[PDB]
Design a protein around this ligand. Structure first.
Ligand SMILES: N[C@@H](Cc1ccc(O)cc1)C(=O)O
Ligand SMILES: N[C@@H](Cc1ccc(O)cc1)C(=O)O
Lengths: 319, 317
């Protein structure tokens, strides 16, 4: 079964640090623990669903799952007042549950629950003493709200993230590939504090609907709160080059959200365009897209329909 | 004493007071204003430390409650050693400061780790970090950090904590060498943003070494409280003491900052013509004119410094 759980765990993962460690981890200790941390956000979008889906894969593969609602991190990264963040954190927990991470499959933890404890703060000070400002600053390049002229709070942020792995008893740290430098810092520094180096699983960074970097500004992304009509509109005008698989926003939704959740995707089409076709794997879909057998217009309609089913169900649970 | 005498005593030998207006108001409105000086525990206590110790004595004489913060966590963040090593040095420093005159009967001692790891304090550190730019924090540590470039993250946290010590210790007047000015300005601007009062700051000058240059452990151009009498005499005899020149003259500075304030007067033996100086102005005037020769001044300075250190070592045990 090791082989099949390894396949599921690494599905749609961009990188695993390291493969061997992950394998031996599944071997020794039949109770592996993985987590993902999230700065509470008023808007939960496909990007979040990227790592959420990976947590569901892991839970299906036998892992214990922890979801860290990193409220202190959100504060340090200028996401608002403690009060505002506390409210978004509760909202986020509801959504994650509604998306499938129910409290019987995952344990939700609030950073403030332990990040102000004496043992944790002392570790932060030790981490700060052995970490150069340079290394810390560089680890935050793709994470900090401020790339240039950051606040001291953003330099403390990576140290705390690394410590969250140790204090939550995590064996596998899951996160987007933009968390890579922070995870390497953890692997290098945690042992110096008497903690084990974590295995890391990185997911790819989803490009926005326009084919460029996803940005809260442009709004080139889909939120779990977007109504069916809005989802349809955004997909309709999304960048989707015919025969181009990589960096294709629509293909990405099929690959990362629909197929993993539904198993297959039916693309209804008029007879003159080929008639209804069903894809049991992404490689089959991509192959037809690459060859021109599957046209962007038909794929878009199907992706919008499945995504809407996904979100509708989410809202249903969300009550 | 009246307000005038208190202000003269407090500002005596200060390089800067931020601000004198705030200081007068503090004294006129608060019954027991509080002042402090923080020190990273150090293996060697020297005349530089005795400079701020004397200022705390002046403040206490003026009615202030004085606190000595043994900043153990700060020493750790500024790479002074393991917690174990720093703890031992902190204990030693406390005994030395008590021996020098800041006895537990007249000053309160606080160890940083007693409160710097508490929830309320740590939360304030996060709040301070949130409103302080890395650039300002780094710049404030220019003359404080052990690492000029390539500093550790611990050294960027350091100034935030020093600023917060002022609020958490209930301090009204922060005392420190002029090299602490940037951290103090950070405190004056950001503490109010966290809902705390802006402290009055009093800065003492940086004491030049015995060769007239920057004190350095490499040179040994300074007097340590542990130096035996003959070593103090040897170091003073050999010290930079430019004839007729007063500014940053190491020997005249010892008379100015340590002897006159403490003994109230300084007797200099001279052949027939012993002279008693009651003010540094009188002493300096005679030095500039040539009426007071460097050799005679050196012998007197060594004598008084040895009385001070000998007494301290006796109290130390
Ligand atoms: N750094 C993560 C959030 C996070 C915070 C703390 C952690 O322990 C883990 C993850 C992000 O940018 O999404
Ligand atoms: N920064 C001071 C030490 C200090 C530490 C903490 C304080 O609150 C005050 C002072 C020095 O360099 O000597």
């Amino acid at each position: 079964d090791i082989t099949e759980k390894l396949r599921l765990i690494t599905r749609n993962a961009e990188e695993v640090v390291t493969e061997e460690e992950l394998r031996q981890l599944i071997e020794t200790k039949e109770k592996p623990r993985a987590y993902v941390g999230y700065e509470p956000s008023g808007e939960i979008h496909l990007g979040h669903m990227m790592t959420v889906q990976k947590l569901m894969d892991l839970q299906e593969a036998g892992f214990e799952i922890i979801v860290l609602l990193a409220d202190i991190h959100a504060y340090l990264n200028e996401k608002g007042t403690f009060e505002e963040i506390a409210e978004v954190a509760d909202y986020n927990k509801k959504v994650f549950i509604a998306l499938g991470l129910d409290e019987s499959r995952a344990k939700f933890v609030l950073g403030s629950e332990y990040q102000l404890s004496r043992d944790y703060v002392l570790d932060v000070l030790k981490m700060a003493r052995i970490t150069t400002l340079n290394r810390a600053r560089r680890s935050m390049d793709e994470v900090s709200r401020r790339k240039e002229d950051p606040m001291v709070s953003q330099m403390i942020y990576p140290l705390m993230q690394a410590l969250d792995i140790a204090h939550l008893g995590v064996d596998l740290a899951v996160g987007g590939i933009d968390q890579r430098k922070i995870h390497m810092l953890a692997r290098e520094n945690l042992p110096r504090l008497g903690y084990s180096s974590p295995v890391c699983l990185h997911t790819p960074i989803l490009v926005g609907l326009d084919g460029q970097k996803m940005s809260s500004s442009k709004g080139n992304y889909i939120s779990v709160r977007d109504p069916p009509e809005e989802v349809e509109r955004k997909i309709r005008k999304a960048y989707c080059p015919a025969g181009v698989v990589e960096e294709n926003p629509i293909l990405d939704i099929a690959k990362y959200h629909i197929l993993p959740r539904f198993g297959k995707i039916v693309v209804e089409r008029d007879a003159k365009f080929g008639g209804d076709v069903e894809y049991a794997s992404f490689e089959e879909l991509a192959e037809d897209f690459k060859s021109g057998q599957l046209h962007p217009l038909d794929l878009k309609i199907a992706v919008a329909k499945y995504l809407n089913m996904l979100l509708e169900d989410a809202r249903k649970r969300l009550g």
